């Protein structure tokens, strides 16, 4: 019949439901880690914000169009595989973070399947670190 | 040896953040 | 080194990036669907609120443990398959809604993979007779 | 004949959402 509000309906159901998750899953988040997921809020939104044009940059970089997933990656981890100081962890988050704001058109799983895995893990490593590093 | 640009700058950055941290 | 911060600092910033992903989804989304939206997050707030119990023993059916997400997928697609009217796909919805905050300590993946392809499209479709009804 | 239990509900709730929201 009248199908002109179908695709609409479906993404919007999609970012509905991808927030709920996100509550459900800070509701779980005792008081110690609520205190130290909002300095990662806090610390990365400071860091996009004095680094932008930088970071602007970088994002040229791997906003073209010749560019796999798996190749994006490569340029955003390499720092880290040979500097793993926290403030280049941070550095590379903001980074990340950044790359989630503009790419809302996007796929979410476009975005998750650069940070997921290695990316992930090596700025877990040493995780104490790093949260004394914002906290 | 070059570090791909993007790596390049963000440890450019990342030293930037280690000076005013401290 | 000391490890016994890394999980916490991978959780973290798995619920983190899976935020600011959203954000960028909503930036992009005109004055219109962001209404929509808002209309979404009320009447499923308003349904799980009222429906609370009934949606407990549903729960219950669901969150047992000899049971795969095609399973939990049939036993909530089944009303829809009949019966299509805009307070079912609500209904039905509102119920997805309420196991998202719920499992918080899932992979949100296992609630993702209930909605997406047959779940989204069979709610999507006349979706406009769905707006018209929250609207 | 018979549903689910979850789809009976749900189709219940439904049934209950239309009448209201008249």
Redesign the interface.
Known sequence: ?????????????????????????????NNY?KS??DR??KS?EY?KKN?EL?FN??YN??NINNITTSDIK??????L???S?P??K????S???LI??????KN?AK??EI??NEI??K?????????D?ID | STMGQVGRQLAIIGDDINRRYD
Chains 1, 3 share one sequence.
């Not at chain 1, 309906?9 to 927030?19: P, Q």
């Not at chain 1, 941070?90 to 988050?93: D, F, G, N, R, V």
């Open positions: 019949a009248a199908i002109e509000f179908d695709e609409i309906v479906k993404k919007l159901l999609n970012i509905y439901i991808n927030d709920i998750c996100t509550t459900g899953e800070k509701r779980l988040l880690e130290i997921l990662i809020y990365c860091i680094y930088d940059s970088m970089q791997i490569s340029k955003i981890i390499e720092a595989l040979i500097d100081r403030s280049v941070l550095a590379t988050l980074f990340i973070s989630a704001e503009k790419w809302g058109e979410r975005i998750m940070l997921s992930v893990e700025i877990s490593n040493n995780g104490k670190d790093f949260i590093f």
